[PDB]
Amino acid sequence: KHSLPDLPYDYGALEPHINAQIMQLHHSKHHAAYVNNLNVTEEKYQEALAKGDVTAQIALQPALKFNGGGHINHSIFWTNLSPNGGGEPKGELLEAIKRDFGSFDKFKEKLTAASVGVQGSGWGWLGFNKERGHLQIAACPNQDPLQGTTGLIPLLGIDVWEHAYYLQYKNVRPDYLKAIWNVINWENVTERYMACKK
Amino acid sequence: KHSLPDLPYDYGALEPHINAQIMQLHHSKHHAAYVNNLNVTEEKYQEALAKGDVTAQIALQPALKFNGGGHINHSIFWTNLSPNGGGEPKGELLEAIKRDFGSFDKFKEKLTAASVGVQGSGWGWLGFNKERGHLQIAACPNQDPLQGTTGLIPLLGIDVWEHAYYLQYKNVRPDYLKAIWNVINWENVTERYMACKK
Amino acid sequence: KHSLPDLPYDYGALEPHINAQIMQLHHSKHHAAYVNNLNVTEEKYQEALAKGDVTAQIALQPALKFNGGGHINHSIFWTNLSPNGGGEPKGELLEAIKRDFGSFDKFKEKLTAASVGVQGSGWGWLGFNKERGHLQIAACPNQDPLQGTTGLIPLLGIDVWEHAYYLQYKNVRPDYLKAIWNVINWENVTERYMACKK
Amino acid sequence: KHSLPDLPYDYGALEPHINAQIMQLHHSKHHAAYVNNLNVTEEKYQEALAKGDVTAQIALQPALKFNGGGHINHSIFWTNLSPNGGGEPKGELLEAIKRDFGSFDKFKEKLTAASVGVQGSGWGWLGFNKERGHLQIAACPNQDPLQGTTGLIPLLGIDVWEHAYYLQYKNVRPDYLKAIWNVINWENVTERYMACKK
Ligand SMILES: [Mn+2]
Ligand SMILES: [Mn+2]
Ligand SMILES: [Mn+2]
Ligand SMILES: [Mn+2]
């Protein structure tokens, strides 16, 4: 059984960068929808699985990738932002970003171009490639999860579905991305990094 | 070479159903963007094609499908709404629908479910299957147009991208749907029906 | 637990149209691979499901659609051909084909164009659309099943992966399709039809 | 406008590794087909483009990606084999591979697994990531070319479509793979390495 995680800050804690109204609808409407449908779908699936019914298992796959992915991605998302975040990573995480993108700024330009560039709904991700020992940016469509579709471990992700910025920045998806770099909980992406290194 | 069509009604005209601020953004910002990037892609494709560069041509296909399909689809969408819209179609279109669906209500139910059901960004479409001579409800992702990708002739489309409803309906995509029926310009839909029995 | 079905005729029973060597490799090498990997994958999945692990369930989806689909499709395939088949359907099935494609011959041209037309590996299908009460041809990529991806009930399908004709017809995929119409067990596609009508 | 390149060796030359009958079919029938349908599509696209017909352009994209990518990919493939092939690369390419993979053996293992692992028709590719300056193993489906779809520069490709091995290896795609190492023309691969550090 899956549950909606509690938000770790209040809904208006990230104003002026992302405001309360967006935070509230994102969490308790959208994310709530995903874990409920995830729970329904996993249940239908199990029953299909027991009957040995392969047509049903395959029929169910799009709902399980959409709702399972939504739940995963929004859950990493909420911990990736903090009332008290922004600035630059430190330690090993920042030297991996220098090692792989040249510098933090060339890292920002590249994750801003990938997120801005998604055609339709999607997410931009900073991920860890454990097969190669290095950081990598990937973009994903719809709610498709970074690890399950790609194999990379998600460290920082940015929602660019229009429900994530539209009441506030309207169509200006670059203004949302300039705003977002101000609330990034670098302390959490460092920890995400650190568990791969384990 | 491609021009943003003029909306055939003032922005404020489909109130209270679709509000004036969505109509201005959707037309002047969302559709205007598609036309302009389509123009730039067609031109680059022309050069790529001139030179026999198959890599460049393959690399420009997403851009050309996204923006060209975006321009097709919003232009049909604007002719599908009217201040004088709503109600029911009469004559040969209503007969067509009744054979194919049973009742306008079943039709309406089947296309609302096809619209509300899209995952991520996309469109639901009432189309005509020329080979079979029959009406068909398709759904397309992102901006992929009906004819170019399915071969169905576009009769009626309803955009369900979040930018089409969010400022007014927020996440309640069914409330948007129920309201859009009130401005559907059945005159234009039947012209299109008339034209592929042409 | 899934098992390789027994072939209902000997491996050379369909010469000269499809020969023994192809039949043997298709059944006991290729189809055998699919049900074994289906059995491994369903098992991994169940265990992922129990742990509530969504990333693993999604990771497993391509192997479950590929191997589950392979098993389904090849299993319908073997019953679709007979040493003693060919000719034309009778009864209701033939009047549905007249009703939907105009005639049996216009039915053959259309399922031959769809199978010939698949780009890469795939299958052409004659299917039943239970939502609309009519027959429909669909083409599918790789081993994606007709009912699980599309919702149509499979009645007659044609494998056009190259392992299905290459040792015999080489690249001339039209020669394989002319040959195949001679071994089609129409008595079985009638029965498949009849269970939808139930 | 596009021409089938002449094979740089006689058909019989990669015996016993790849036999003479596969080399004749693959070149004169499989690749010759791609070139010719590419020519016909480029021309129709030209007309579609001349007229500002975005539907026609979108409808011709599969054909143009299938056939153009098919022509790209087989042409690089023929320069990748040699009668005088096999063994190991030496010099700067072998250094590159060793940094990126560890040993030629790990490289060979990782690309064989990426090749044997494709589902359906496709290709495995050793590529260069220009932005990162590093070697990458990609796999592509059907005929989608590396650069046009991933941006990686194509260094070494191995076709794993069934027509590339079936007449000689039947379903044992690993035996094909193990043998193809014996004709890889590492001279041509390194020219390509040399050229995007150009
Ligand atoms: Mn979201
Ligand atoms: Mn729109
Ligand atoms: Mn097969
Ligand atoms: Mn080939």
3-state SS of chain C is CCCCCCCCCCCCCCCCCCCHHHHHHHHHHHHHHHHHHHHHHHHHHHHHHHCCCHHHHHHHHHHHHHHHHHHHHHHHHHHHECCCCCCCCCCHHHHHHHHHHCCHHHHHHHHHHHHHCCCCCEEEEEEEECCCCEEEEEEEECCCCHHHHHCCEEEEEEECCHHHCHHHHCCCHHHHHHHHCCCECHHHHHHHHHHHCC
Please check whether residue D21 touches C, CB under 8 A: no
Chain B neighbors of A171, CB-CB under 8 A:
25, 29-30, 33, 163
A4 occurs within a structural domain = no
Question: Is residue C108 situated within a structural domain?
Answer: yes
Contacts of D120 in chain C (CB under 8 A): 120-122, 141-143, 161
CATH number at residue D172: 3.55.40.20
Distance from CA of D99 to the nearest CA of C (A): 29
In the numeric block, which tokens belong to residue B57? Answer: 């041509």
3-state secondary structure of B7: coil
Burial of C43 (0-12, 13-18, 19+ CB in 10 A): exposed
**Nearest-angstrom CA–CA distance, C156 and B49:** 42
Query: How far apart, in whole angstroms, are the C-alpha atoms of residue D75 and residue D6?
Result: 9
Domain boundary among C59, C82, C105: C82
- Measured in angstroms, how far is the CA atom of residue B46 from the centroid of ligand 2? 27
Type of residue at A46: Q
Distance set, CA D153 to CA A53, C69, D181 (Å): 43, 34, 21
Q: Is C15 on the interface with A (CB under 8 A)?
A: no
Q: Which residues of B touch A62 (CB under 8 A)?
A: 119
Inter-residue contact D48 to D186 (CB < 8 Å): no
Query: D186 lies in a domain?
Result: yes
Q: Which helix (H) or strand (E) holds B76?
A: helix B61-80
Subunit contact C148:A72, Cβ cutoff 8 A: no
Say if residue A69 is exposed, middle or buried (CB neighbours under 10 Å; 0-12, 13-18, 19+).
Answer: buried
Q: What is the DSSP string of A88-146?
A: ---THHHHHHHHHHSSHHHHHHHHHHHHHT-SSSEEEEEEEETTTTEEEEEEEETT--H
Q: Domain count of chain A?
A: 2
> Helices B173-180 and B104-116 sit at what angle, rounded to 10 degrees?
140
Is the domain of C159 the same as that of C188?
Answer: yes
One domain for residues A129 and A181: yes
| Maximal CA-CA distance, chain D | 54
Q: Which residue of D has its CA nearest to C34?
A: D119
Angle at C140 between CA C135 and CA C144, to 5 degrees: 115
Give strand pairing partners of A141: A122
Same-domain pairing of B49 and B30: yes
Contacts of B173 in chain A (CB under 8 A): none
- The residues that bridge with B136 in the sheet, in sequence order, are B127
Angle at which helices B32-50 and B61-80 cross, to 10°: 140
User: Residue B117 corresponds to which tokens in the numbers above?
Assistant: 């059901």
Three-state DSSP class for residue B81: strand
- Is there a contact between B148 and D54 if contact means CB atoms under 8 Å apart? yes
- How far apart CA B112 and CA B174 sit, in angstroms, is 8
CA atoms within 13 A on the CB side of A151: 5
The annotation places the binding site of A for Mn(2+) at 26, 74, 159, 163
Same domain for A112 and A195, yes or no, is yes
Task: Looking at the CA of A72, name the nearest ligand.
Answer: 1
Are residue B147 and residue B176 in the same domain, yes or no?
yes
Calculate ∠ Cα B76-B80-B83, nearest 5°. 140
Q: Are D10 and D18 in contact (CB under 8 A)?
A: no
**Contacts across the A-C interface (CB distance below 8 Å):** 76
Whether residue A135 contacts residue A127, with contact meaning beta carbons closer than 8 Å, is answered with: yes
C123 and C66, same structural domain?
Answer: no
Amino acid of residue C67: N
Shortest CA distance to B170 belongs to which of C93, C75, C3, A28? A28
Q: How many residues does chain B have?
A: 198
Return the ∠ at Cα D196 (arms to D192 and D198), rounded to 5°. Answer: 110
C108-116: list long-range contacts, CB under 8 Å, 24+ apart. Answer: C108/C181, C110/C137, C111/C137, C111/C156, C111/C158, C112/C174, C112/C177, C114/C138, C114/C139, C115/C139, C115/C158, C115/C160, C115/C173, C115/C177, C116/C160, C116/C173, C116/C174, C116/C177
Residue D105 Cα distances to B170, D94, D117, D155, angstroms: 56, 11, 18, 18
**Environment class of residue D143 by beta-carbon count within 10 Å: exposed (0-12), middle (13-18) or buried (19+)?**
buried
d(CA C138, CA C127): 7
Q: Judge contact between B130 and B91, C-beta under 8 A.
A: no
Assess whether the previous peptide bond of A16 is cis (omega < 30° from 0).
yes
The CA dihedral of C112, C113, C116, C122, to the nearest 10 degrees, is -90
In angstroms, rounded to a whole number, what is the distance separating the alpha carbons of residues C115 and C113? 6
Phi, psi dihedral angles at B121 (to 5 degrees): -90, 150
The answer to whether residue D196 is domain-embedded is yes
Report the separation in Å between the CA atom of A104 and the middle of ligand 4, taken as the mean of its atom positions.
43
Run of H or E including B153: strand B153-159
CA–CA dist D128, D193 (Å, integer): 8
Instruction: Write out the residue range of the structural domain in which residue C59 sits.
Output: 19-82
CB distance B49 to D66 below 8 Å: no
Interval between CA D26 and ligand 4 midpoint (Å): 6
Nearest to C146 by CA among C63, C74, C40, C96: C74
* Contact between D14 and D26 (Cβ < 8 Å): no
What does each C-alpha distance from C190 to A117, C5, C157 come to in angstroms? 51, 21, 13
**Chain A nearest-CA residue for B168:** A167
- Answer yes or no: is D4 within a domain: no
Nearest CA among A90, A100, A81, A79 for reference residue A6: A79
Whether D115 and D144 share a structural domain: yes
Q: What is the CATH number of the domain that holds D63?
A: 1.10.287.990
Ligand nearest to the CA of A31: 1
Q: Is the Cα torsion angle A101, A102, A104, A106 positive or negative in sign?
A: negative
- Mark whether A141 and A67 lie in a shared domain: no
Residue B131's Cβ-count burial label (10 Å; 0-12, 13-18, 19+) is exposed
What are the two backbone dihedrals, phi and then psi, of residue B135, each rounded to the nearest 5 degrees?
-75, 140
**Is-contact D142 D121, C-beta < 8 A?**
yes
Whole-angstrom distance, CA of residue C96 vs CA of residue C156 = 14
Q: How far apart (Å, rounded) are the C-alpha atoms in residues A163 and A121?
A: 9
| Residue partners of B178: CB distance under 8 A and separation at least 6 | B112
Structure tokens at A46: 């199990």
Characterize A26-57 residue by residue with b for buried, 16 or more Cβ atoms within 10 angstroms of its Cβ, and e for exposed: bbeebbeebbebbeebbeebeebbeeeebbbb
- What is the Cα–Cα distance from D19 to D166, expressed in whole angstroms? 11
Shared domain for B135 and B55, answered yes or no, is no
Would the CB atoms of B64 and D42 count as touching at under 8 Å? no
DSSP letter assigned to residue B60: T
Q: Is residue C11 part of a domain?
A: no
| Closest C-alpha to B131, from B147, B108, B115, B107 | B147
Please report the resolution in angstroms: 2.2
Greatest Cα pair distance in chain B:
54
- State in Å: Cα B107 to ligand 1 middle: 31
Subunits with 3+ Cβ pairs within 8 Å of B are A, D
How far is residue D107 from each of residues A81, A129, B175, D97, measured CA to CA in Å?
39, 17, 56, 7
Question: Is residue D139 in some structural domain?
Answer: yes
Nearest to B142 among A66, A120, A170 (CB): A120
Question: Residue A81 and residue A99: Cα distance in Å, rounded?
Answer: 24
- Residue C46 sits at the vertex; the CA angle it makes with C45 and C51, to the nearest 5 degrees, is 95
Last residue of a domain, one of D66, D82, D98: D82
CB contact under 8 A, D72 and B55: yes
Rg (CA), chain A: 17
Residues of C in contact with D33 (CB under 8 A): 171
* Phi, psi of B22, rounded to the nearest 5 degrees: -55, -50
Euclidean distance between CA atoms C29 and D172, whole angstroms: 9
Diameter over CA atoms, chain A:
54
Q: How far apart are CA B148 and CA B161, in angstroms?
A: 19
Starting at the edge strand that comes first in sequence, how are the strands of the sheet with C153-159 ordered?
C134-141, C122-129, C153-159
D105, D161: one domain: yes
D160 CA to centre of ligand 4 in angstroms: 7
Provide the β-strand partners of residue C140: C123
B141: enclosing H helix or E strand: strand B134-141
> Smallest Cβ distance to D171: which of C142, C163, C170?
C163
* C52 contact residues in A (CB cutoff 8 A): 1-2
- Determine, for residues A71 and C56 on separate chains, whether the beta-carbon distance falls below 8 Å: no
Say whether both A47 and A115 belong to one domain. no
Q: How far is the CA of A28 from the centre of ligand 1 (A)?
A: 11
- CB of D49 within 8 Å of a chain B CB? The answer is yes
Contact D120 C161 (CB under 8 A): yes
Chains that touch A (3 or more CB pairs under 8 A): B, C
Burial class (CB in 10 A: 0-12, 13-18, 19+), B84: exposed
Largest CA distance in chain C: 54
State CA A127 to chain mean position distance. 11
**What distance in Å separates the CA atoms of residue D19 and residue D16, rounded to the nearest whole number?**
6
Interface residue D162 vs chain C (CB under 8 A)? yes
Give the tokens for residue C143: 């081993």
- Secondary structure letter of residue A7 according to DSSP: P
Extract the tokens encoding C194: 């009849």
State which residue of chain D sits closest to C144, comparing Cα positions. D120
Give the number of whichever ligand sits closest to the CA of residue B70: 2
Q: Which residues contact D108 (CB under 8 A, 6 or more apart)?
A: D181
Number of H helices, E strands in chain D: 10, 3
Same domain assignment for residues B118 and B70? no
The 8-class DSSP code of residue D45 comes to H
SS3 assignment, position A41: helix
D66 contact C CB<8A = yes
* Closest ligand to Cα B166: 2
Min Cα distance A64 → chain C (Å) is 8
Q: Which of B42, B44, B49, B61 to mutate to test the interface with D (most CBs of D within 10 A)?
A: B61
Instruction: Residue C122: name the closest of C78, C172, C61, C173 by CA.
Output: C173
Whether the bond into C154 is cis, omega within 30 of 0 = no
Beta strands in D3-103 (DSSP E): none
- Asked if B65 has any chain A CB less than 8 Å from its own CB, the reply is no
Count CB atoms within 10 A of the CB of residue D133. 10
Query: Token pair of C152, please?
Result: 């149509």
B94 to A117, B158, D39: CA distances (angstroms):
42, 19, 45
* Minimal-distance CA residue of chain B relative to D53: B68
CB B128 within 8 A of CB B153: yes
Give C26 Cα–ligand 3 centroid separation in angstroms: 6
Our CA-based measurement puts residue D134 at a distance from the nearest CA of chain B, in whole angstroms, of 21
- C-alpha distances in Å from residue A40, one per residue of A72, D90, D168: 16, 57, 49
Q: Does B116 touch chain D (CB under 8 A)?
A: no
Does D173 map to a domain?
A: yes
SS3 A197: coil
Given an 8 Å threshold on Cβ–Cβ distance, is D120 in contact with C167? no
User: In 10 A of CB B3, how many CB atoms?
Assistant: 8
Bridge partner list, B99 = none
Question: Which residues from C are below 8 Å from A71, CB to CB?
Answer: 54
Output the CA A115–ligand 2 centroid distance in Å.
19
Ligand 4: centre distance to CA D143 (Å): 8
For residue B62, how far is its CA from the centre of ligand 3 (angstroms)?
32
Residues in C 130-149 with any Cβ partner in A closer than 8 A:
144-145, 147-149
Structural contact between residues C52 and A2, judged by C-beta atoms closer than 8 angstroms: yes
